[PDB]
Amino acid sequence: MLTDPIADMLTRIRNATRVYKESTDVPASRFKEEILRILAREGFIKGYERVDVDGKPYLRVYLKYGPRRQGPDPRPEQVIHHIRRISKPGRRVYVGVKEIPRVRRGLGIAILSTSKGVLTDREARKLGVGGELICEVW
Amino acid sequence: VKELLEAGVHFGHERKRWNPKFARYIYAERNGIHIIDLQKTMEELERTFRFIEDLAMRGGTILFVGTKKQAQDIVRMEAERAGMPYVNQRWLGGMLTNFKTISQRVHRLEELEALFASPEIEERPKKEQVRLKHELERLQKYLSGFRLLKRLPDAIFVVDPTKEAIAVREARKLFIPVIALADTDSDPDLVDYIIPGNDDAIRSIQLILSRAVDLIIQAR
RNA sequence: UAGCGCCGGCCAACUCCGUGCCAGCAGCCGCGGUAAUACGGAGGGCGCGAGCGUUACCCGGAUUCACUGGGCGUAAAGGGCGUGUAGGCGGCCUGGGGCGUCCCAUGUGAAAGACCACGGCUCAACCGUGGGGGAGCGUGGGAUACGCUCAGGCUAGACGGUGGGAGAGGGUGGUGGAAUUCCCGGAGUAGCGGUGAAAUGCGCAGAUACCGGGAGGAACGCCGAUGGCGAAGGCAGCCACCUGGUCCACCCGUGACGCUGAGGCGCGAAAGCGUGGGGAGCAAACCGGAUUACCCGGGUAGUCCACGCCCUAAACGAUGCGCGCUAGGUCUCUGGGUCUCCUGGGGGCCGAAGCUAACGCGUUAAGCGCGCCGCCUGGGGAGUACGGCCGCAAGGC
């Protein structure tokens, strides 16, 4: 059965990205939509909206790419190069304020589920709180 | 529209052959055939013609590559009715990436045709004459039209981007923009400026090439 | 007072003599049989210097036990296959608790050591004085996003209902024909059979060909498939009964009832074995013949059945199970619909992206992810020895 929804969402995004789709669908959830809004704000995705698919709530994600490249392999540069899931079922990862990782010298983002809502690494450091480490994107 | 529709432009290949990447130009399926959306064809044609006219008025040269059975005559006539070089017999591996080597062959061809029009052939017993004549025949068969390239062209015009995938690949390697009259079974990614239409049915090829050549002539 | 090591590559330092697989050097690769930068001695050079080398031990290099940071198709590594206990993990929407989790204050975290700063020995080692830092654990307070728990709901997972479908899936009885071998007859003449060629062998007690009647055992010719069923091992005549699994349609009921699974329990080709039956044909062992100085003629256990053991394989897809996402083309088996076509499930062949040391895999992944389990850590010695458990034994773990 489906054991990890957030990992599933990350995998769906990655798979759709690698084939240069304009859209992808993931089952709707509050946590998922929070992650999606966080991703959209940092300009990793074009946008998202809540759609209805065969009487079931779904979230449609719009993917963003770079300009068409010159020469052989003219496929556009990806915006989301790499998206891992840190805290998995069976091994939960928690970090304090002093232990929030810096991803790619600040060129990436680490998304935290803090006590004050789902924040990025920067917002978590600014507010001075820690929590479950969800994912890193660069 | 109203020009392409009667030319059989919007008639593609059977469902056995179509490429998934080309679905963005397919309109619908009729009687087990693919129909190309002629509107999208119109915008793409407009864009490619704008590019062609800009290049022509800049003074650049376009190389025409059509190596099908039927497209030979039309390509030959259209290129001849312009300053544009053409290849229609066969695409030799390395016409572009190995342009230096083939330039040597072009020079050999020109010197040979000059030699046969010279009074020093009274020597060289007739067997050597036969050998040289056969060599000249081969060269003028293959290298005709290609003689008009003094250097690498600025663009390329391929009729079937799959029949001539090698030329497309070579054009990619050297950052030469690719213009193609691609069809259902083609890859749109390898073509910068694409005309979604039929590459069979001589009518369509003639129409597109005639229009393009007229635009080139006008834009001089 | 200037010594010690080294000069083939790692690794910075090259020539001349003695040497001829001898004397010897060596951490590895290796150097030495008359032209050695590798051996021994000189000259020169390099590195360190009152030290320079050697041996022993630890860490690193070793991502070579991999949490950071590995792998199991062919390199060592997927259990022979199921069911399932403990355990691990776990859909969508609200609410209460604040156990995990995060934050703040505070107590502790001795001194010395580590760090920073300033000073005392003429410098330094050494020492002194201040200042922080500090994993962890108490104590008080705060937060509720994610885990946990509790309460109330939802149908997308799972199960049931209803109406159909295909199938060598299994067990129990019954019986259909074609062979093969014997028995009983009728006719039959000299061979039959066998081989690369032959021999052994059978036949005058009349063989082999052939006609009829009878007995007995074993296996199911065409259909037949690159087909189907099953969790594996496996399953082909036909008929009937008792049963297992599975697919589609209606979306009708339930509300998360799910996944995996250390031990346990069960199944497990073929060959063996105990206790009784049966024995047509084939055939280990064995008796013969012969040639190329394997092959033909006979034949025992065994292959067949009932009960009980044995538990092994190239038990292979050399690929554990479950779920989700990622172009298609083509051939098949089986359903449903509005039937050139759509829509499910199963089995093959090419091949996008991607992956791989490569071969190759590719919607039946060896791709991208998650959960759980089982294994791997150079080759032999060795699946050996000892010990334990299971078998009548051979043997198995």
UniProtKB/Swiss-Prot annotation, chain A:
Gene3D superfamilies: 3.30.1370.30, 3.30.1490.10. GO terms for biological process: translation. GO terms for molecular function: rRNA binding; structural constituent of ribosome. The keyword Ribosomal protein applies. GO terms for cellular component: ribonucleoprotein complex; ribosome. Keywords: Ribonucleoprotein, Ribosomal protein, RNA-binding, rRNA-binding. Pfam families: Ribosomal_S8. InterPro entries: Ribosomal_uS8, Ribosomal_uS8_CS, Ribosomal_uS8_sf. The keyword Transmembrane does not apply. SUPFAM superfamilies: Ribosomal protein S8. Part of the 30S ribosomal subunit. Contacts proteins S2, S5 and S12. NCBIfam families: PRK00136.1 (NF001109). One of the primary rRNA binding proteins, it binds directly to 16S rRNA where it helps nucleate assembly of the platform of the 30S subunit central domain. The combined cluster of proteins S8, S12 and S17 appears to hold together the shoulder and platform of the 30S subunit. Belongs to the universal ribosomal protein uS8 family. This is Small ribosomal subunit protein uS8. It comes from Thermus thermophilus (strain ATCC 27634 / DSM 579 / HB8).
From Swiss-Prot, chain B:
InterPro entries: Ribosomal_uS2 (IPR001865), Ribosomal_uS2_bac/mit/plastid (IPR005706), Ribosomal_uS2_CS (IPR018130), Ribosomal_uS2_flav_dom_sf (IPR023591). Pfam families: Ribosomal_S2. Keywords: Coiled coil, Ribonucleoprotein, Ribosomal protein, RNA-binding, rRNA-binding. It comes from the Bacteria. The keyword DNA damage does not apply. The keyword Ribonucleoprotein applies. Residues 98-143 form a coiled coil. GO terms for cellular component: cytosolic small ribosomal subunit. Spans the head-body hinge region of the 30S subunit. Is loosely associated with the 30S subunit. PANTHER family: 30S RIBOSOMAL PROTEIN S2 PROKARYOTIC AND ORGANELLAR (PTHR12534), SMALL RIBOSOMAL SUBUNIT PROTEIN US2M (PTHR12534:SF0). Belongs to the universal ribosomal protein uS2 family. This is Small ribosomal subunit protein uS2. It comes from Thermus thermophilus (strain ATCC 27634 / DSM 579 / HB8).
